[PDB]
Write a protein that binds this ligand. Sequence first.
Ligand code: CAP
Ligand code: CAP
Ligand code: MG
Ligand code: MG
Ligand code: MG
Lengths: 160, 457, 455
Amino acid sequence: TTIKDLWRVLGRPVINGGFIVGTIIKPKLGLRPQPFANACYDFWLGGDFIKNDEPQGNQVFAPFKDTVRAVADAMRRAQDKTGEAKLFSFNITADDHYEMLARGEFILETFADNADHIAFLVDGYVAGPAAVTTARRAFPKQYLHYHRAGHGAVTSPQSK
Amino acid sequence: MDQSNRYANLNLKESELIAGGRHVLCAYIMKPKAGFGNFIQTAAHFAAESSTGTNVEVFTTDDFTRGVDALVYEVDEANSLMKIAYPIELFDRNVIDGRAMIASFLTLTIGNNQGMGDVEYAKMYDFYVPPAYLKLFDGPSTTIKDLWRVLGRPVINGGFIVGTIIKPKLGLRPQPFANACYDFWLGGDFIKNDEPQGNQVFAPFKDTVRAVADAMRRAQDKTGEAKLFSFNITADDHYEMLARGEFILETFADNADHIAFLVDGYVAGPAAVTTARRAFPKQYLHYHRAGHGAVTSPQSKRGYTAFVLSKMARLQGASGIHTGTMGFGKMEGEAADRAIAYMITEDAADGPYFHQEWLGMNPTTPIISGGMNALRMPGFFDNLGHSNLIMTAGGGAFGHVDGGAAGAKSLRQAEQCWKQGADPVEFAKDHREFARAFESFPQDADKLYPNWRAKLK
Amino acid sequence: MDQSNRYANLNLKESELIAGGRHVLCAYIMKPKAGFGNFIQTAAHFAAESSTGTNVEVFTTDDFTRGVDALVYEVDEANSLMKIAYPIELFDRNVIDGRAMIASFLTLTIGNNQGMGDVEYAKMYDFYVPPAYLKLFDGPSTTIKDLWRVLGRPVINGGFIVGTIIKPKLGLRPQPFANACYDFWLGGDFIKNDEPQGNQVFAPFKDTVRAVADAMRRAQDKTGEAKLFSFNITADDHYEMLARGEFILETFADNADHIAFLVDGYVAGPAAVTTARRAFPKQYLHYHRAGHGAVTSPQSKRGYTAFVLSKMARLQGASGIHTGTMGFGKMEGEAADRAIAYMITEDAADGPYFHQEWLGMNPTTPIISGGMNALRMPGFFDNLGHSNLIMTAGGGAFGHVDGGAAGAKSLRQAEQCWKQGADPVEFAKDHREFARAFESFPQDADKLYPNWRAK
Ligand SMILES: O=C(O)[C@@](O)(COP(=O)(O)O)[C@H](O)[C@H](O)COP(=O)(O)O
Ligand SMILES: O=C(O)[C@@](O)(COP(=O)(O)O)[C@H](O)[C@H](O)COP(=O)(O)O
Ligand SMILES: [Mg+2]
Ligand SMILES: [Mg+2]
Ligand SMILES: [Mg+2]
C-alpha cells in the first residue's frame, strides 16, 4: 500500500495527489476515550489524517476497544459534517504477533465501510522487523505507517 | 403488474449518474417474451427483481426501500438496449474488512433476472463502477512487472513472455511431464499446467511438483536464464488450495518467486479466485476461464460477455486472465476483442457503453492462448498492437516437428519477426525453428503464406 | 484434423461402460458449425478438448495417455445427441483427503469445450457417476429430517415446511426486517434471507442477525412452536463466510440448530458451497442458484440444464436446492421438472439419459420458490405428488392483504387443502386466510378458479 491508496480514499488524483494535512493526538498519553475522540473530531473539521501518538494503545485509562469505537464514531461525525473523507493511523504495536492481529482485526471490523480509511502504525525500531512484517503480511491492503521511536540511539550523527 | 412508474426514470441523465458517483450502471441487450409486458414494463420488472422488489406488491415496502431501488434510466427498444442504475448501497460488503465482493455484484445484476418467465433473454455487455465502489475491490497485487523482474526484463514494457501448456492435457506421468517442461524451457520462458492437471492418480501432485522443480533448476543451470511455471491449485475446498500453494512454494524454495498460481475461476467461482488472491498476494494469480463460453459466446443471448468477465476479473485481483486469440486461434473470438485487453491493462479505457477510470488499480495481463502457433502470431500482434503479454501455445510448441525447444524457439522468433516488421516467409529463410513451424502446421502455412514452399524450399 | 479414429469408439456398449464402473458418462445436445468437421469428427475433437488432447497432434503423447482418452461412444446426429465416456482417473482429487471435487468434473466435461470455434453449441443434459467416483463426493450431511426434528415433526415424511423470503429484497433496516420475521413466524415455520441480503450499509449484518434472533425468541414464546431461519453467508472470501456463520451460531445460542446457511452457489461457485458444507456440516446448507438461468434456460443451447445443476448440488452436499416451481410460478420451468426432485430425493432415479444409484448418499430437499402463493400451490403439489419439502413465498406472504401472519396461514392451509383432497374454492369457504389470498391475488384467482367470487 502507498500514498496512492490514501489519495484515492481522499478523492485526490492518484498521481501527485498532494499534501495530506495531519496531526498526532496530544497529550501523548492521558486522554480518556471520549476526550480523545473529541480531539479527533475537532482536528478532522479542518484536516485529513490523524495518527495515534506512538505509545497510545490499551492503557488502563484509555482501553483500546473503547478508544477505537469512540474514534470510529468521531470519523463518521466529521465525515458527515464536512462531506470529506478522514483517515486514522492506529498503533497496533505489540511484542505478541497475536495481539497485533487482534488489534488490527478489531479496528477493521469496527470501522466497517470506513475500513479503507485506516492505516496501521508499527513502532518498527523498538518492536523490530518482526513486528513490521506481521503488519505488512497480515494487512497488506492497509497502509503500513512505520514509526521509528528509538532510532536516534544509533542514527544520530553524535553516534559513530 | 406494471412497475414502470417506480422502477423506470428515463429523465435521469447518464452523465449526472456517473458524476454523482453513487451508482453502478449496467447495459443489457434484452428482449421481452411474447404475451407479457412491453419493453419498459419488462425492463422495470427486471430492475425490481435485480434490487428491491418481486413480481407483486408487498406491504412491507417503505420509502427508505424505494430510495435504493435500481432504476431503468435509458432504453432503446429498436436496438434491444436497457440501461439500469444500481445504488451502490445495495451491494454487500465484508464484515471482516469492509471490502466489496463480486458475488453480490453478480447476484443483483445478473442473478435471478436470468430466470424470469416474462423475459426471452438478457445479456450484460458493460458495467460502470464509480470510485466509491471501485476502491473497495481487491484489484491485482502481482502483475506482469513481477514476472519481467524475475526474467531480468525491464519492469515497464518488458515485452513478450514465450509460453506453453504441457500437452497431453492429461496422461503424462510425473517424469515425462517434467521432461516436456525441461525441453520447452531450453527455448521458452513460461509453462502453465493444462487447466485440469493436478492430483490425478497417475500423476500425483507432490511427485509432479517435485519433478517440475528439478526440471526448472536443470533448465536454469543449462540456459543461464530464469524460467516460470504456473501451477493449477484449483479445488472446491479452500484448505486444499492452501495446501497445494504452500507445498509448491516450499518445494521451489529459492525459485518460489518464479511461480504463478492458476485458478479455474469460472467453474470454481469467485470464491476460489479470492482464496488465491488473499492467501498468496505475492504470487502471480493466473485466471483460467474454462466454461465461460457457455454464457460469453455471441451465440448466447444470456448472461454476460467476455468483456464483462475480464473486467470483473481485474476487480477480483487476477494478475492475468485469458482474453482469447481475438479470432486468430481455435476458440470463438473476434478482432474487436482487442478492446478487452485495453480495458484490463490501461488506467482509463472505453467499453462498448461506458468509459472507466481505474484510479491506479493494477493492470491484469491479457493471456493469449487457444490454437496459437508461430505462423498465426504476426497477424494476432498486428490486430492487438503490442506484445507486452503472455502467450501460451500447447499444440503450437509440442506439435513442432523438431520438439518442444524448437517449438518454443519458433514462438520467440515469430514475435521477433513481428517486432522487426519483417515478412514472415523472408524472415523464415534465416530462422530455422520458425521455418520448421511451416512444415509442422502446413495447413496454417498454405492459408496464411501461399507459395511459402517455393520461397522456403 | 480428424481425430475420430482415436477419440470415437461407437462399438462400446453403454450397458458395459456402466457395469464396468470405470467411467463417467455425459450426454450432450451438440451442433457443429458449418465449414468444419462432420458430426463424428466434431464430437471426437470435443472429447479430445475435454480429456487428453488439443486441436493438433503433439509428439509428447504416449500409449498410457491414449488409455485415459475420453471416448465418443454413442451419437444420434438426427437428434443432435453425443454421449462421451470419461475414464474416472482423469478427475482431480484432493491431496489432503483423497476426495473428489466438482470443479474438476466441470472443467473437463463442460469447460473449454464451451468456447470451441468449430462447435455452434453443446449443452449437457445428463451425466452418470459410477460408485468408485460417487463415493468420493461429500454428499449432504444435514437433510430435511434435521429440520423436521427441530419442528417436532416425524423424521420420516414430516411433511410441508411453510416458508417465506423477507421482502423487500433489500431496503429494510434491521428492526423493520425483524418485525416482518416475527409477523410471518406467528403463522409459518421457515424464513430465508432474500439472496442478496447480508451486510448492506443500511442493514449491517450483526445488527440484523441480533434483531432476527430476538424476533425468533419472541415468536417461539408467543406461539409455543419452533421457528427456522436460513441466513445468507455468501462471500468471495472464505474467512468472511466463516465469520458470518460463527457469529450467527453464537448469537442464536440455544436456537443454533434452528439455523440454515444459504449460499449463492451458482454465482459464488462450488468453492463457496464447499466452504459451508465442510465448515458447518451440522447446519442445513441451503443452495440458492441465482444466475443459473444464463445457462439452464431451454432458450440456451449451451452449458448444462437445471437437472444437471441439481444433480451436481447433491454431490456437493447441498441439504436443499431450489428446483423451481415446474411452470406453476414466475420463473422459467416445465411440469416435467418434477423428475429433478425425484433425482435429488430418491436412492435410485432416472435422468433423461442415465439411471443413477445413489448408494445411500443423503437426499437434497427440493426447495420450491418463485412467484408462489396459496392459490398456485394445489396445482403444484398435484404435479409433484408430495409435499415433503420447503416452499418459500415472498410476494405470496407479504403481498397477502391481511399481513405476513395471514400470508403464512394461507400457505399452510393450501397444503392442507391438497393433502385433504379438497376443492380449493369449497375449502376457502371455511378457511379465511386462504379465502383472502384470492382477494390478495385476484388475477391468479380469476385464471385458476373462474367463479370464486360468486362461491
Ligand atoms: O486447453 C487448451 O485448449 C488450452 O490449454 C490451449 O491449448 P492449445 O495451445 O494447444 O490450443 C487453453 O486452456 C485454451 O486456450 C483456453 O481457451 P481460452 O484462452 O480462450 O480461455
Ligand atoms: O428473489 C426471488 O424472486 C425469490 O426470493 C422468490 O421470491 P418471491 O416468492 O416473491 O417470488 C427467489 O430467489 C426465487 O424464487 C429464485 O428463483 P428459483 O427458485 O427458481 O431459483
Ligand atoms: Mg509521537
Ligand atoms: Mg488448457
Ligand atoms: Mg430471492
